[PDB]
Design a binder for this molecule. Structure first.
Ligand SMILES: *[C@@H]1O[C@H](CO)[C@@H](O[C@@H]2O[C@H](CO)[C@@H](O[C@@H]3O[C@H](CO[C@H]4O[C@H](CO)[C@@H](O)[C@H](O)[C@@H]4O)[C@@H](O)[C@H](O[C@H]4O[C@H](CO)[C@@H](O)[C@H](O)[C@@H]4O)[C@@H]3O)[C@H](O)[C@H]2NC(C)=O)[C@H](O)[C@H]1NC(C)=O
Lengths: 214, 295, 176, 217
């Protein structure tokens, strides 16, 4: 099949900027390339075909160029509704294949995560397992490292991460790490803590909890 | 992409999976090049704008009639048909292969004499959106002479499940100077169009090879007084070419081992259905139908 | 009641039977329905050999028969003079060809097919019935044994078609 | 008014068969070819293939050939994608799209059909509190929605009164084959005790609705 390769795998820009995604084919595809835009839970919208032609309906601010093997997509003057991931597609030789996408995240000033660590419920332990969860709240970029340490000891292959889609209003991310243990292994320790590294932190901030607090 | 009729174009494409489509550019048959728009078949949806429309043709979904507009009213059109090349060979879906003579004998021919008039006929299971066209000529020389009528329906010999439909056509060679012998074969060309699918067939032949004469004219008897020797005589068919001497015939006299072939126009047999066929004296062409008579 | 018909018929028959021999003993060879005539624009036998009935007029040279030939000719001395002249000229060509080929077929150690002498003879028995005095040449190329066996089927086919047209004329004259 | 409307989200166990549809309208149905595309959990788009509305002229991507089946009942203007034996790997979003003629790309898209293939049986979730610690201000809290199947599940606060500050995370497929998410809220430390907070969990695939109140301790 013809390998479609988009780059950058992702970028960040502000409202009103001129941005340009690229796309390139493992072979020649003439001018038979289309561009699609997709948003989180929504379906893809069809924007550009024949490399440089706008589908009836799409805004003036869009445009594309290239033929043969190297194609691009450009937004003269960016805008809010234009924030999404974008896919190119080769429709020259079966099977028609897509690019792996290019996400457009908003560009905003660096911000550190509010950190919180949560004890398991007394209600859950008397059930069998324990979920200690750690919350990094509202930050940027979504580049963050979270490590659990029970009694100063590191933990591996034990947590599950999960991060949100850039807030629509404050342009921010937020994640939750979840370390999960059986009631047994849980009772067998005192110091539960998650240490959070991030470029918005001049030094790894660690939130912990032992087992007191009335 | 080439032109069939005016405003009717054929594009050819091979059916190997990893093969491309064709980038064709449709121009509008108009003087002004301003605010025009394109459409396809009966859909109202704009495909693009400009006196010119560049498209790709890969599937029958890309075929059909592109129409350019301006101010609501239609401007002109371009129909497109696909000629499908499966793998070296072209498609032959519409006409049935009546593998009677050799094989791949899609269109057949017969002539009732040496006049130049002959009739061709093909078979097809299809019964809708059909449109034929016949052309003919002997050798690369005189493009004229041979002219052809219109293909018409002729039969409906139903068969298990699908019904069969026969189409025939009539043709007439007219040489400004007739030759005493055919040195080049007559050639028939049929353009077959079924909906959006285009195909064309071809057959070459000598008239001397596809001759079927009408059955012997009229027969009689002559037992005479009381001896029972059935004597049978006839006459050369009306359609057969003349002079009958320069264009001899031969005959086969049958009955209901015992078959008797002969040249002369009369003979006598032994009494007991009776019948007699006729064949071009010179070549082993086709025998005529039978002509019966009481015992 | 006509001399030439007799030979014309003998010829058509002889070629019909020799043609059948070839395409019945020559299998691994293209001898199946390829069609060429050696007397192309060389001889005007094709142009003017149709009855006077069809040649309504000379709409489309060497006319001088020989006393002692064939004479149910209240119609052969006619416009057909250009036909008989040519026809004879045809027999002279096919004559050297079969003659040559038979020379070869005789030498071929792979004794595959032989040219029936009878058919070589009836081509002569026909030209000494038409009489006719003529001066003419045989440029060309020479084949091998296999090559020649190919050029045979081509000639026997073209020749039967020619022999037929011959019989057509002879059948025509005999009746008028 | 072109509209490709697809059938609702389905959930099956490996080995079951399944046929999903996509009814089209607002356009001349027999003029445009229809196609399907898969999109696996957090991944790109797999072009499954393309086909005609009138005649049975289909074009499968070699990777899906003989794995799936495309069809179309033009009398009701509906295209179909079909499996005979689903695998876990088959779980994804399945879009159907319209192929723009004289080009080959997709004009318009269906809204998607979520398809889940798991050896897990349907189950409501357990809701547990994530009580605020001690910040004598701005404190955090929320409900931990754990061990349910399948997705989706809905989560609001105070019957929908509280929104500004809610972060309901994307669920996570646990190794047990069951899903789990967490929904939190950021409030001022001064509202703990005054106007209580309750997370409303609703998991339609089993009638289950749970309302857990979150408080300090
Ligand atoms: C039965 O079926 C077969 C297969 O479909 C038909 O064959 C096609 O017939 C058409 C006849 O026009 C052919 O189209 C012609 O092709 C010509 C030459 O081919 C080359 O052209 C350029 C070269 O620079 C390239 O695109 C490439 O090298 C091609 O191979 C063209 O020259 C013709 O175009 C125009 O030229 C003249 C110039 O004087 C113009 O006046 C005319 O507009 C003319 O159209 C044209 O496109 C086609 O090539 C054939 N296909 C193949 C593969 O052979 C039979 O014709 C059809 N039987 C019939 C006649 O009914």
């Amino acid at each position: 099949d013809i390998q479609m390769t988009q780059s950058p795998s992702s970028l960040s820009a502000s409202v009103g900027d001129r941005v340009t995604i690229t796309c390139r084919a493992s072979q020649g595809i003439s001018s038979w390339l289309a561009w699609y835009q997709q948003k989180p839970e929504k379906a893809p919208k069809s924007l550009i075909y024949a490399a440089s032609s706008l589908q009836s309906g799409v805004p003036s601010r869009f445009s594309g160029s290239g033929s043969g093997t190297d194609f691009t997509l450009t937004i003269s003057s960016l805008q809010p509704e234009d924030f999404a991931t974008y896919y190119c597609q080769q429709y020259n030789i079966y099977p028609y294949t897509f690019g792996q996408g290019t996400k457009l995240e908003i560009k905003r000033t660096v911000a550190a995560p509010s950190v919180f660590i949560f004890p398991p419920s007394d209600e859950q332990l008397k059930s069998g397992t324990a979920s200690v969860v750690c919350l990094l709240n509202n930050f940027y970029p979504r580049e963050a490292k979270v490590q659990w340490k029970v009694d100063n000891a590191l933990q591996s292959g034990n947590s599950q991460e999960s991060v949100t889609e850039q807030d629509s209003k404050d342009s921010t991310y937020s994640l939750s790490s979840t370390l999960t243990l059986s009631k047994a292994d849980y009772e067998k320790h005192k110091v539960y803590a998650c240490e959070v590294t991030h470029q918005g932190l001049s030094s790894p901030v660690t939130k912990s909890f032992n087992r007191g607090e009335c | 992409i080439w032109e069939l009729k005016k405003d009717v174009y054929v594009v050819e494409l091979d059916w190997y999976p990893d093969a491309p489509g064709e980038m064709v550019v449709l121009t509008c048959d108009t003087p002004e090049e301003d605010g025009i728009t394109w459409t396809l078949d009966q859909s109202s949806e704009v495909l693009g704008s400009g006196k010119t429309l560049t498209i790709q043709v890969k599937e029958f979904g890309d075929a059909g009639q592109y129409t350019c507009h301006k101010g609501g009213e239609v401007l002109s059109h371009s129909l497109l048909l696909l000629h499908k090349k499966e793998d070296g060979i072209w498609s032959t879906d519409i006409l049935k292969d009546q593998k009677e003579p050799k094989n791949k004998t899609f269109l057949r021919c017969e002539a009732k004499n040496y006049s130049g008039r002959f009739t061709c006929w093909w078979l097809t299971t299809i019964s809708t959106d059909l449109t034929f066209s016949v052309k003919s000529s002997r050798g690369s020389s005189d493009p004229q002479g041979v002219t052809c009528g219109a293909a018409t329906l002729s039969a409906e010999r139903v068969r298990g499940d699908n019904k069969e439909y026969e189409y025939s056509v009539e043709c007439q060679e007219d040489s400004a100077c007739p030759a005493a012998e055919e040195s080049l074969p007559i050639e028939v060309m049929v353009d077959a169009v079924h909906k959006l699918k285009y195909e064309n067939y071809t057959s070459s032949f000598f008239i001397r090879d596809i001759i079927k004469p009408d059955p012997p004219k009229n027969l009689q008897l002559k037992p005479l007084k009381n001896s029972r020797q059935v004597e049978v005589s006839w006459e050369y068919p009306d359609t057969w070419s003349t002079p009958h001497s320069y264009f001899s015939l031969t005959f086969c006299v049958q009955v209901q081992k015992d078959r008797v072939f002969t040249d002369k126009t009369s003979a006598t047999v032994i009494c007991r259905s009776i019948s007699v066929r006729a064949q071009d004296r010179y070549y082993s062409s086709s025998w005529s139908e039978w002509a019966s008579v009481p015992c | 009641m006509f001399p030439c018909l007799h030979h014309s018929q003998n010829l058509l028959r002889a070629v019909s039977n020799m043609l059948q021999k070839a395409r019945q003993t020559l299998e691994f060879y293209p001898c199946t329905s390829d069609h060429e005539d050696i007397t192309k624009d060389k001889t005007s036998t094709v142009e003017a050999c149709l009855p006077l009935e069809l040649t309504k007029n000379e709409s489309c040279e060497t006319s001088f028969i020989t006393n002692g030939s064939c004479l149910a000719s209240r119609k052969t001395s006619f416009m057909m003079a250009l036909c008989l002249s040519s026809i004879y000229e045809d027999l002279k060509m096919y004559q050297v060809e079969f003659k040559t080929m038979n020379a070869k077929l005789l030498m071929d150690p792979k004794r595959q097919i032989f040219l029936d002498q009878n058919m070589l003879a009836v081509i002569d028995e026909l030209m000494q019935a038409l009489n006719f005095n003529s001066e003419t040449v045989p440029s060309l190329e020479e084949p091998d044994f296999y090559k020649t066996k190919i050029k045979l089927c081509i000639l026997l086919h073209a020749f039967r078609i020619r022999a037929v047209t011959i019989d057509r004329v002879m059948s025509y004259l005999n009746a008028s | 008014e072109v509209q490709l409307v697809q059938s609702g989200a389905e959930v099956k166990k490996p080995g079951e068969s399944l046929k999903i549809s996509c009814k089209g309208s607002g356009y001349s149905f027999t003029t445009y070819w229809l196609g399907w595309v898969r999109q696996m959990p957090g991944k790109g788009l797999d072009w499954i293939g393309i086909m005609s509305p009138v005649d049975s002229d289909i074009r499968y991507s070699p990777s899906f050939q003989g794995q799936v089946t495309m069809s179309v009942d033009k009398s009701i203007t509906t295209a179909y994608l079909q499996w005979n034996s689903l695998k876990a790997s088959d779980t994804a979003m399945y879009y159907c799209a319209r192929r723009r003629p004289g080009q080959g790309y997709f004009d318009f898209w269906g809204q998607g059909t979520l398809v889940t293939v798991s050896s897990s049986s349907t189950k409501g979730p357990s809701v547990f509190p994530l009580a605020p610690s001690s910040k004598s201000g701005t404190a955090a809290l929320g409900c931990l929605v754990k061990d349910y199947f399948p997705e989706p599940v809905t989560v609001s606060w105070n019957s929908g009164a509280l929104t500004s500050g809610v972060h309901t995370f994307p669920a996570v497929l646990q190794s047990s084959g069951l899903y789990s998410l967490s929904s939190v809220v950021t409030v001022p430390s001064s509202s703990l005790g005054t106007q209580t907070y309750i997370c409303n969990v609703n998991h339609k695939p089993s009638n289950t609705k749970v309302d857990k109140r979150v408080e300090p301790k």
